[PDB]
Ligand binder design. Structure first.
Ligand SMILES: *[C@@H]1O[C@H](CO)[C@@H](O[C@@H]2O[C@H](CO)[C@@H](O[C@@H]3O[C@H](CO)[C@@H](O)[C@H](O)[C@@H]3O)[C@H](O)[C@H]2NC(C)=O)[C@H](O)[C@H]1NC(C)=O
Ligand SMILES: *[C@@H]1O[C@H](CO)[C@@H](O[C@@H]2O[C@H](CO)[C@@H](O[C@@H]3O[C@H](CO)[C@@H](O)[C@H](O)[C@@H]3O)[C@H](O)[C@H]2NC(C)=O)[C@H](O)[C@H]1NC(C)=O
Ligand SMILES: *[C@@H]1O[C@H](CO)[C@@H](O[C@@H]2O[C@H](CO)[C@@H](O[C@@H]3O[C@H](CO)[C@@H](O)[C@H](O)[C@@H]3O)[C@H](O)[C@H]2NC(C)=O)[C@H](O)[C@H]1NC(C)=O
Ligand SMILES: *[C@@H]1O[C@H](CO)[C@@H](O[C@@H]2O[C@H](CO)[C@@H](O)[C@H](O)[C@H]2NC(C)=O)[C@H](O)[C@H]1NC(C)=O
Ligand SMILES: *[C@@H]1O[C@H](CO)[C@@H](O[C@@H]2O[C@H](CO)[C@@H](O)[C@H](O)[C@H]2NC(C)=O)[C@H](O)[C@H]1NC(C)=O
Ligand SMILES: *[C@@H]1O[C@H](CO)[C@@H](O[C@@H]2O[C@H](CO)[C@@H](O)[C@H](O)[C@H]2NC(C)=O)[C@H](O)[C@H]1NC(C)=O
Ligand SMILES: *[C@@H]1O[C@H](CO)[C@@H](O[C@@H]2O[C@H](CO)[C@@H](O)[C@H](O)[C@H]2NC(C)=O)[C@H](O)[C@H]1NC(C)=O
Ligand SMILES: *[C@@H]1O[C@H](CO)[C@@H](O)[C@H](O)[C@H]1NC(C)=O
Ligand SMILES: *[C@@H]1O[C@H](CO)[C@@H](O)[C@H](O)[C@H]1NC(C)=O
Lengths: 66, 410, 98, 49, 49, 48
């Protein structure tokens, strides 16, 4: 629900508004289904829709030395 | 016979600012035209698909602002980061690499974000937060700084920055010993040129104007859209509730059909102007995505595409609704006159330079690279032969130095 | 009937002063005037660097510079004839006016 | 086993034409819709912006 | 609607001219001020000037 | 302990030689310079 204030009727408040029916995960993945403000959703393991901040890629310390 | 050749150079840094995305504004034509007013809704639905094709059209614009933001910044395969020791050959990126002490924007990106400024309306959030644009631009920075063009074309192969700039100098036709003999000067020229930007974005407002215009056009398009709710359009009141109090349905439904005709033409105006504006901004997002692939992820041979002067490299800095490129350019300096010739006659053969240009200090003669006077004695190791003194106009008589004959004479 | 036509900022004479400067930059100083200062270079040598940039070695200009002057001069005359005989080339401007 | 290599060249001077600017035509909204009529102008202001 | 039709045609025709002015600005920067190595961008044959 | 020269975009280790190298100035100005021989493809021929 876009911009609504999340006591306005599994249940959660993204920056984009209230997301119902998906679990918020302390993890990140590629942005499978977009939602906005860095939040995305995907279908994962027992299966559910999960919601998370997207990941921009593998972090890589290029092994620079002079 | 007259040529001028630079004795010296200035590395200069220039700022190019490009729009990338509008605000993702969307407007319910139901609540804009009618809104908590079923007597109007029952009238509006008779005009058929118009409100559905407006919601669909502004939704197309909204999704495209995230495609534009994606195609400019999300070019990099991985989130590269720098080692702890900043041993970049004495070049100093302090203003432009991210501050761990803050979003983790860089110093120059903060100065960029510091210099840019309700019924039926909605504003959707962009898909990449400003912090995610700052992580993508840090990946683009640290990729470019540690691995040259290679992260744009495969793996991020590391190289020392003193040698990365030697490839960039070699690429503009300036022989790489010109870098190595001058690397302390060149680091000081680069560093103080980013310093001039760190001043300019703090003291002066004019640079961000090209992003501020994207903001000002949208705020004026929405104020104009909302002020059109107050207009009469020939109905007895512009307030929808006044008609739905003061008049019975047989008159009120004709009065409302004037308002619906008006409030529908204000939306068709705004949505057409936002479709046109989105095409204008998408052409700048495609220009930005191009400049990032060609000038950051590469080195551009394209004249005045990445600033005046020959392009060494460039750095992206995020900005609200846009991108900023710090283009780095060799600009030639301190030219001197010399007599020149296309070729020389030595024992009657015409000798031509392999890559350089022939020049004279009034008396003797030298080859040099064209972009920086570095005279070298005219040997067989820096010339090639074709034909004889007849066929070339203005061929000079001068000695060529054979480099074998001193060795063989021993 | 409420219709009006504003003048362009640059007059067509001032546009001819810009094209004149771009000609003089390109003829006297090669590509250099795009990168900063106009470093002069003789035009026969400028064309040897234009040739060298496309993988034809400098001697192939210098051994043939009389032929290349005549080919170029011929081709410039052909453009005056081609513009003079038919307006159809300017059809991309004329469509915008129409 | 075979390549063709050009034994000569032709310099060509191909011409290309590009449009750059429109005529800067501006039309006044009121003098177009209403001409000099004060009564039409007072009705035109009911359509707002 | 007669005026707003013409303005909407001109906003689209202006963008078709901006797309062409940007191409003419690009061809001047690369092909007058420089020597492009971009095939067919500046005439058939290999570009000299 | 010993050094090679290669093209940049594919590993092909040649010997460091007077055909594939050029000179400018004495050591001290190049920050990070190293010590190695440069083979000469023609200077051994004094004996023959
Ligand atoms: C043009 O460039 C040449 C570079 O070869 C200049 O000639 C060279 O100049 C140096 C000194 O600058 C000469 O060596 C020194 O000459 C003085 C003369 O008093 C002597 O005391 C020293 O023991 C030493 O020999 C060098 O011989 C000379 N080379 C040649 C081939 O002539 C030249 O001066 C420059 N400018 C002009 C106007 O010619
Ligand atoms: C560059 O050096 C060449 C070779 O020394 C110079 O060209 C040659 O100049 C000589 C006289 O200095 C010419 O020989 C004379 O020819 C006349 C007839 O023209 C004859 O009566 C004399 O007995 C004598 O043989 C020679 O023909 C000429 N060769 C050519 C190919 O022109 C040249 O002048 C020098 N140029 C410069 C810019 O220093
Ligand atoms: C390379 O191609 C060019 C054309 O792109 C050739 O240029 C000109 O070609 C004509 C023949 O098609 C030459 O005509 C001959 O000229 C002499 C007098 O110079 C005349 O007596 C003959 O009856 C005949 O018409 C013309 O000379 C030539 N232009 C120049 C300035 O050379 C060129 O011939 C080609 N290169 C070679 C090696 O043939
Ligand atoms: C890189 O540039 C920064 C400035 O952007 C330099 O940092 C300054 O260094 C002096 C001397 O250590 C300090 O007194 C200043 O407080 C520093 N900050 C500023 C904003 O001036 C830094 O020294 C440069 N060199 C390196 C290798 O980092
Ligand atoms: C080339 O230009 C640089 C500056 O861009 C010159 O370096 C300056 O040299 C003077 C003394 O001649 C010093 O006072 C300055 O401190 C130097 N500036 C910098 C930024 O280091 C250099 O001398 C010039 N000359 C040549 C032949 O390269
Ligand atoms: C450069 O141009 C000059 C003309 O400006 C050419 O002609 C010679 O010019 C010198 C004086 O600069 C005179 O002493 C000669 O007598 C002129 N030649 C003739 C045939 O009279 C000159 O040949 C040109 N040089 C080059 C290198 O192209
Ligand atoms: C390369 O090796 C030479 C010796 O073969 C080094 O030169 C000596 O360096 C010491 C440094 O304290 C001086 O005391 C000597 O006088 C130098 N001898 C000569 C002949 O110059 C040189 O420093 C080495 N270079 C590098 C970059 O390692
Ligand atoms: C509603 O939104 C505001 C911020 O816009 C926030 O302060 C408030 O806590 C929200 N309401 C609830 C129930 O959290
Ligand atoms: C490379 O790193 C080492 C670290 O001790 C340093 O001594 C050396 O001067 C550096 N070389 C260059 C060319 O930066």
């Amino acid at each position: 629900y876009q911009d609504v204030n999340c006591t306005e009727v599994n249940v959660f408040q993204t920056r984009a508004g209230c997301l119902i029916g998906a679990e918020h995960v302390n993890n990140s993945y590629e942005c499978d289904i977009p939602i906005g403000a860095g939040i995305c959703a995907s279908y994962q393991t027992s299966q559910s829709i999960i919601a998370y901040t997207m990941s921009l890629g593998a972090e890589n310390s290029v092994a620079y030395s002079n | 016979n007259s040529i001028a050749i630079p004795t010296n150079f200035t590395i200069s840094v220039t700022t190019e600012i490009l729009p990338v995305s509008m605000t993702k504004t969307s407007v319910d034509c139901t609540m804009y035209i009618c809104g908590d007013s079923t007597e109007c809704s029952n009238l509006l639905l008779q005009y058929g698909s118009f409100c559905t094709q407006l919601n669909r059209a502004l939704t197309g614009i909204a999704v495209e602002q995230d495609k534009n933001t994606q195609e400019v910044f999300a070019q990099v395969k991985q989130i590269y980061k720098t080692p702890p020791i900043k041993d970049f050959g004495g070049f100093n990126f302090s203003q432009i690499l991210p501050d761990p002490s803050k979003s983790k924007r860089s110093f120059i990106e903060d100065l960029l974000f510091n210099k840019v400024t309700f019924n039926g309306l909605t504003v959707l959030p962009p898909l990449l937060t400003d912090e995610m644009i700052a992580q993508y631009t840090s990946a683009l920075l640290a990729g470019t700084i540690t691995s040259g063009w290679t992260f744009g074309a495969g793996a991020a192969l590391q190289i020392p920055f003193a040698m990365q700039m030697a490839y960039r100098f070699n690429g503009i036709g300036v022989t790489q010993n010109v870098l190595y003999e001058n690397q302390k000067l060149i680091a000081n020229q680069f560093n103080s040129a980013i310093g001039k930007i760190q001043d300019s974005l703090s003291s002066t407002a004019s640079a961000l104007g090209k992003l501020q215009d994207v903001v000002n056009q949208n705020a004026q398009a929405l104020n104009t859209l909302v002020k059109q709710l107050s207009s009469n359009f020939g109905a007895i009141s512009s307030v929808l509730n006044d008609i739905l109090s003061r008049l019975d349905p047989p008159e009120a439904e004709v009065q409302i059909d004037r308002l619906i005709t008006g409030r529908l033409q204000s939306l068709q105006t705004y949505v057409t102007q936002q479709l046109i504006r989105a095409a204008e901004i998408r052409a700048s997002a495609n220009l930005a995505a191009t400049k990032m692939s060609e000038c950051v992820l590469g080195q551009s041979k394209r004249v005045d595409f990445c600033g005046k002067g020959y392009h060494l490299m460039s750095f992206p800095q995020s900005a609200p609704h846009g991108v900023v490129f710090l283009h780095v350019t060799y600009v030639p300096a301190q030219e001197k006159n010399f007599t020149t010739a296309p070729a020389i006659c030595h024992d009657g053969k015409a000798h031509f330079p392999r890559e350089g240009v022939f020049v004279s200090n009034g008396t003797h003669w030298f080859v040099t690279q064209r972009n920086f006077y570095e005279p070298q004695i005219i040997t067989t190791d820096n010339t090639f032969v074709s034909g004889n003194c007849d066929v070339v106009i203005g061929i000079v008589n001068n000695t060529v130095y054979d480099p074998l004959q001193p060795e063989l004479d021993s």
